[PDB]
Amino acid sequence: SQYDYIELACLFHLPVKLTMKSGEVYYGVAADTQRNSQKQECIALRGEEETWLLETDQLSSMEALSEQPHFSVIHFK
Template sequence: MISCSEYDYIEIACLYHIPIRLVTESAQVFEGKAKTTNYDHQRRECIVIDTLCGDIQIPTSTLVSMTALTDNPHFSEITFQQIS
C-alpha cells in the first residue's frame, strides 16, 4: 500500500493522461498513458494504463516508481514507499 500523498501523483497522472513508465517490485517495466484507477478481481487497487497492447491493470501495492515520459508541471519521477 502506498501513502495518500504518493497516491495523489497517480491520480494526477490519470487526470491529465500523462504518459508514464511504471516499475514494479518484480522489476517489470510498463509504459503507457495513465487512464484511471480501479480494483482488480482480487480487490487490489490498480492503476490502468493504455499501452500498445491495450489497457492493463497494475496493482499500486507492487509499484516501486513512476516516471513521466513527457514534461509536465506536476512530477517527473516518483519513488513509492510501500507501507503496511
C-alpha cells in the same frame, strides 16, 4: 499537503513509465484507478497493444514520459 500522483497522472492522462517491485517496466497512458477482480487497488495503464491493471501496492516508481510541471520520477514506499 500530500498529493496523490497516481490520481493526478490519471486525471490528466499522462504518459508514464511504471516500474514494479518485480522490476518489470510498463509504458503507456495513465487511464484510471480502479480495483481489479481481486479487489486490489490498481492503476489502469493503456499500453501500446493492451491495457494493464497494475497493483498500486506493487509500484516501485512512476516516471513522466512528457514535459509537465507535476513530476519527473516518483519513487514509492
